[PDB]
Amino acid sequence: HHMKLLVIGNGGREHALAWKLAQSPKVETVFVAPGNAGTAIESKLQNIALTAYQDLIEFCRKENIVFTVVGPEAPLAAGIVDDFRAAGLKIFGPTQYAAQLESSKDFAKAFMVKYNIPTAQYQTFENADAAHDYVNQKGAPIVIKAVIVAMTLDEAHAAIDDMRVVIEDFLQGEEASFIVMVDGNHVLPMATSQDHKRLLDGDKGPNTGGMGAYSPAPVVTPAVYERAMNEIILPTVAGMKAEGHEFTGFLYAGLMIDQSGAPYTIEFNCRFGDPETQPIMSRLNSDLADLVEAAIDGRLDSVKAEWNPQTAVGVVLAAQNYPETPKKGDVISGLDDVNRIGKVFHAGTTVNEKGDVLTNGGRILCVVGLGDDVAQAKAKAYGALEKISFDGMQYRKDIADKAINR
Ligand code: NA
Numbered sequence: 001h002h003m004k005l006l007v008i009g010n011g012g013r014e015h016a017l018a019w020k021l022a023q024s025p026k027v028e029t030v031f032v033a034p035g036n037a038g039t040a041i042e043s044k045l046q047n048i049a050l051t052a053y054q055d056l057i058e059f060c061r062k063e064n065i066v067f068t069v070v071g072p073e074a075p076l077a078a079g080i081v082d083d084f085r086a087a088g089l090k091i092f093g094p095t096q097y098a099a100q101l102e103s104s105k106d107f108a109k110a111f112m113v114k115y116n117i118p119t120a121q122y123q124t125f126e127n128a129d130a131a132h133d134y135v136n137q138k139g140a141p142i143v144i145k146a147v148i149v150a151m152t153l154d155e156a157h158a159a160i161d162d163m164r165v166v167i168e169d170f171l172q173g174e175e176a177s178f179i180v181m182v183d184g185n186h187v188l189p190m191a192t193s194q195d196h197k198r199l200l201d202g203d204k205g206p207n208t209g210g211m212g213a214y215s216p217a218p219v220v221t222p223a224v225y226e227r228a229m230n231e232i233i234l235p236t237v238a239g240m241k242a243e244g245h246e247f248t249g250f251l252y253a254g255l256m257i258d259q260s261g262a263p264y265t266i267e268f269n270c271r272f273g274d275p276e277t278q279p280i281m282s283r284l285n286s287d288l289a290d291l292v293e294a295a296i297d298g299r300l301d302s303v304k305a306e307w308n309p310q311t312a313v314g315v316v317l318a319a320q321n322y323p324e325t326p327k328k329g330d331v332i333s334g335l336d337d338v339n340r341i342g343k344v345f346h347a348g349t350t351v352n353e354k355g356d357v358l359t360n361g362g363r364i365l366c367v368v369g370l371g372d373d374v375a376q377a378k379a380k381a382y383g384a385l386e387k388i389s390f391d392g393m394q395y396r397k398d399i400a401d402k403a404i405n406r
Contacts, residue, residue, distance in 0.1 A: 009071035012347035013277040024289040038346020093249040115239035119265040120169040141170040171256035177272040183300040184246035192220040212399035214313040279312030311377035320392025334387040342384025
């Protein structure tokens with residue numbers, strides 16, 4: 001009762017995590033370091049401007065913080081979890097070593113090859129000699145990156161000559177994000193979701209961190225769920241344990257599901273947790289604070305997650321020129337009248353002295369609507385987004401259409 005918690009980061013995923021933690025009747029305050037304009041506005045959320053880990057450790061001691069949750073990759077790769085734990089504090093997130101699973105594609109591919117985790121065949125190349133030899137051995141389609149998706153050997157050999165080259169198998173099918181909580185040994189899967197990482201309607205334009213996601217993702221049938229757990233998630237958790245560096249925290253698995261229902265791992269990476277986390281948290285009925293505490297305690301097998309059966313659709317509003325260097329500093333209008341239509345999660349927003357909310361990053365907002373089916377959830381999300389405006393804003397109008405047409 002009256003617990004105080006700490007969330008590290010400033011993105012839309014962190015807004016959603018802090019907001020959901022604050023729903024617990026047992027939580028009084030969730031501090032967010034540094035937070036954004038959305039977390040400043042939320043009830044029970046308090047932004048704190050601390051960044052140094054020893055400062056955050058003393059803050060936890062000063063305020064009697066029960067536990068800390070870490071969102072983004074950078075503090076994880078810097079060892080925030082190691083530091084907190086050496087200071088005796090409770091924290092949900094991977095150690096610096098275990099975070100390599102999400103922060104180094106070399107470490108992850110090598111790990112996955114070792115533990116026989118399905119993923120794209122992958123090899124890096126010195127000079128064109130063995131590179132052309134490899135492409136001739138593997139055949140097309142195949143991906144050449146230094147990013148050409150080569151449909152023929154001619155395209156692959158051409159891409160090699162033009163361009164250290166990275167040659168990766170092309171994964172066919174449909175993308176899904178498979179997010180799980182891990183306590184080092186046990187797993188508690190979050191609801192499935194599907195992101196839209198291309199910038200523009202019709203999956204055109206450049207790649208992005210994700211322009212909108214919905215949950216559940218029907219491409220992940222019970223059969224696909226079982227395969228993903230059996231072939232990817234459970235062996236990865238067991239493998240990190242067997243390597244002597246258990247993974248703790250949210251594991252963000254990007255999957256490509258082929259036409260046979262076979263899941264292949266794209267990578268484990270933050271880009272499969274935002275904006276995926278937002279609609280997922282909008283569906284979680286359970287007390288997230290209790291789930292996180294059980295995970296920190298190594299007892300995730302003692303708790304369960306229960307979900308609103310309604311679908312949640314989240315639509316990202318982004319700034320002009322994203323995913324390139326974004327236009328910054330534009331006043332955002334209309335945040336006050338969304339009311340019961342939906343929920344607005346902030347990512348790149350800040351407030352100025354006069355109190356206006358300003359764009360302050362690439363992705364600005366994620367607007368989440370709930371519905372009894374995916375069609376209704378999509379209508380709710382766009383209905384809630386309708387009166388938000390800022391100059392140069394961009395968003396896709398086709399979020400979740402792959403689940404509606406079908
Ligand atoms: Na994403």
